[PDB]
C-alpha cells in the first residue's frame, strides 16, 4: 500500500524524483519509513547532465 | 576532468587509505561502529551499484 501511495505522489509532483531528500522535503514519506528505504532506492546519475 | 593513463577515475586512490584508524577515531569521538560501513562505501565508490 505504501508503494502505490508513493508512486501516486511521484506522479502528482511530476513523475521524476530529483534527489533522495525529496522523499522528506516534499512530505512524500515519514521519517522512519524514509530512514529504512533511503539506501535501497537509487536515482541514476548522468555526469553529462549534471556539470555542477 | 583529466583522468590518468588507463584509469577511468581516481577511485583507485581509496586503496591507500587506512580505514582501521578512521574507524578507531570514529568510535572514540562519536561512539559509532562504522568499520564495515567504510568498506561498503569504498566498494560502492569503486563501482556504483554492482551486481551482487
Amino acid at each position: 500500500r505504501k508503494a502505490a501511495g508513493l508512486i501516486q505522489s511521484i506522479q502528482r509532483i511530476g513523475s521524476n524524483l530529483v534527489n533522495r531528500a525529496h522523499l522528506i522535503t516534499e512530505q512524500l514519506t515519514s521519517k522512519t519509513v524514509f530512514l529504512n528505504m533511503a539506501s535501497f532506492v537509487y536515482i541514476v546519475f548522468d555526469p553529462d547532465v549534471e556539470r555542477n | 576532468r583529466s583522468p590518468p593513463k588507463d584509469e577511468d577515475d581516481l577511485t583507485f586512490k581509496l586503496d591507500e587509505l587506512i580505514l582501521d584508524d578512521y574507524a578507531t577515531e570514529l568510535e572514540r569521538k562519536h561512539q559509532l561502529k562504522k568499520r564495515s560501513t567504510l568498506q561498503i562505501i569504498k566498494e560502492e565508490l569503486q563501482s556504483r551499484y554492482r551486481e551482487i
Partner: protein
C-alpha cells in the same frame, strides 16, 4: 576524447546550405546601391594543367579583391572561373566536429589542423529586419531559452540561427578566442565568415569573441575557463559612468551602480579627468572617496574573497580590510573562514609588507589596520589556520619590521591566542 555529437547537433535544427532572406531588399551590399561597375581584379588566370585547378587569386597572391574582403565573381573578373577567392560561394568549409565538455553545451572542434587566417565556416541563418528580430527575441525570452543565436549583419539587419542555420551556432564564447568573425562582400550581398586568428591543431575547440550587446538583458556568467576571463558575457558599456572597477570587486567595496555613477557625474561633468573603462589601472582617489558599510551577506563575502584573490592594488585592499573592520557579523566571518580568508590575507600582507612598493609608515598603518580583525574573528581550531599557514607570514613580517615594536607585540598576542586552539583529524595513508 569526448564522444562525437555531430548528427545529434544537426537534428536539433534545420540545416541550411546558404543564408535565407526575409525579403529580396535585405542583405544587399552598399545599402542596395547596385554597383554595376563591379570591382574586377586584374589577376590573370593561373590554371595548373596537371590538377586542372585555377590557382589565381590565392592566399599568397596579390589579388586586390581578396585584400579588400570582396569575392571574385565568375564571368565578370579577369581571374576566370573557379579562382581561389570563391570560398563563400564554393562553400569550402573547414572540417569540423561537434562534442561536449565542462559546463558548456555542444561545441565545435577542429577535425584537422587549420592554418592561420584560413576560412573556417560561414555563419548561416535567416536575414531578418529589426521588428522581426524584436518579435523573435520576445518569443524566445517567453520560451526561456538560455542561448544567444543572433548576430548583427549590419545596422538594422540581423541574422537568426535559432531554428535554421549552420554548424557555426555551436561555437562558444572565449575571452581569449582562437577565431574571429569578419564581414565580407560576395557579389551584391554581404556575408559573415569565421577566420582563424592563429594556428589551430586537431581536436582543439574553435571559439570566437561574441562582443555581445545585451540590449538591456541581464548578465550571464562566463565559464570559458580562460585566465583573462571577465566573468560575465557582454561588451562595451551602454554609456560612461557605468563601471570604474569590476563588479565583484566594486560590490566587494560596497559600491554599486549608483556609487559608480556618482563619482564620475561629480567630476567628469565638472572638468576633471576620468579615463575610459579599463580595470588594468586602479584609480586610487575613487577607492579612497568610496563609502564603507558593514557586510551582512555571504554572497558579498564571496565577492570580497574574489576581490582579494584578484585585485593587486594596495588601496583597494586597504578599503576592503577597513570594511571588514566595520563588519562584525559572525556568520559572514565563518563564511570567510570557509572561503579561507586567511589564505588571501597572507598574500595581501606579503605583497605590501614583504614586497615594498610603498612607504614604511603607510605599510605600518596598513599592518595595524589588518591585524585588528585577525585578532577579532571567531576561531576554534588551528585547522582553519592550517589551510593558510598565515602564522609563517606573520613571523616573516615581524622579523622584517622588527624595529616597529607595536606590530611585533600585536603579532605576539595573535600567535599566542592562536597557539591554544584544538586540531582535527586526517586519515593516514598506506606507505
Amino acid at each position: 576524447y569526448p564522444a562525437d555529437k555531430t548528427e545529434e547537433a544537426l537534428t536539433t535544427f534545420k540545416t541550411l546550405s546558404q543564408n535565407s532572406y526575409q525579403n529580396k531588399t535585405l542583405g544587399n551590399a552598399h545599402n542596395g546601391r547596385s554597383t554595376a561597375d563591379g570591382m574586377s581584379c586584374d589577376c590573370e588566370e593561373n590554371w595548373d594543367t596537371v590538377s586542372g585547378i585555377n590557382n589565381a587569386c590565392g592566399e599568397y597572391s596579390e589579388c586586390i579583391n581578396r585584400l579588400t574582403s570582396i569575392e571574385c565573381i565568375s564571368g565578370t573578373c579577369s581571374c576566370g572561373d573557379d579562382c581561389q577567392n570563391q570560398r563563400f560561394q564554393k562553400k569550402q568549409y573547414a572540417p569540423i566536429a561537434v562534442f561536449e565538455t565542462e559546463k558548456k553545451g555542444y561545441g565545435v572542434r577542429a577535425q584537422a589542423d587549420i592554418r592561420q587566417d584560413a576560412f573556417i565556416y560561414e555563419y548561416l541563418g535567416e536575414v531578418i529586419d529589426e521588428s522581426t528580430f524584436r518579435k523573435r527575441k520576445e518569443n524566445y525570452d517567453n520560451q526561456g531559452l538560455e542561448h544567444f543565436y543572433f548576430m548583427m549583419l549590419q545596422k538594422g539587419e540581423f541574422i537568426d540561427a535559432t531554428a535554421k542555420g549552420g554548424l557555426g551556432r555551436f561555437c562558444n564564447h572565449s575571452c581569449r578566442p582562437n577565431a574571429y568573425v569578419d564581414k565580407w562582400e560576395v557579389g551584391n550581398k554581404l556575408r559573415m565568415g569565421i577566420f582563424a586568428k592563429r594556428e589551430i591543431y586537431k581536436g582543439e575547440e574553435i571559439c570566437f569573441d561574441y562582443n555581445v550587446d545585451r540590449y538591456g538583458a541581464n548578465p550571464q556568467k562566463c565559464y570559458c575557463g580562460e585566465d583573462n576571463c571577465i566573468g560575465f558575457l557582454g561588451g562595451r558599456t551602454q554609456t560612461d559612468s557605468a563601471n570604474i572597477l569590476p563588479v565583484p570587486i566594486a560590490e566587494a567595496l560596497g559600491s554599486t551602480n549608483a556609487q559608480e555613477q556618482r563619482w564620475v557625474r561629480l567630476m567628469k561633468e565638472q572638468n576633471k579627468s576620468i579615463k575610459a573603462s579599463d580595470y588594468s589601472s586602479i584609480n586610487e582617489d575613487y577607492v579612497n572617496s568610496l563609502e564603507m558599510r558593514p557586510i551582512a551577506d555571504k554572497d558579498e563575502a564571496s565577492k570580497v574573497t574574489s576581490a582579494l584573490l584578484k585585485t593587486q592594488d594596495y588601496i583597494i585592499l586597504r578599503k576592503l580590510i577597513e570594511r571588514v573592520s566595520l563588519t562584525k557579523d559572525p556568520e559572514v566571518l565563518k563564511e570567510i573562514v570557509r572561503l579561507r580568508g586567511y589564505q588571501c590575507v597572507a598574500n595581501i600582507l606579503t605583497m605590501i609588507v614583504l614586497d615594498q612598493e610603498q612607504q614604511q609608515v603607510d605599510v605600518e598603518s596598513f599592518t595595524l589596520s589588518v591585524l585588528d580583525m585577525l585578532e577579532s574573528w571567531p576561531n576554534s581550531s588551528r585547522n582553519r589556520i592550517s589551510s593558510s599557514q598565515i602564522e609563517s607570514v606573520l613571523e616573516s613580517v615581524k622579523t622584517k619590521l622588527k624595529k616597529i615594536q607595536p606590530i611585533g607585540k600585536k603579532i605576539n598576542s595573535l600567535l599566542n591566542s592562536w597557539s591554544k586552539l584544538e586540531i582535527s583529524y586526517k586519515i593516514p595513508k598506506s606507505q
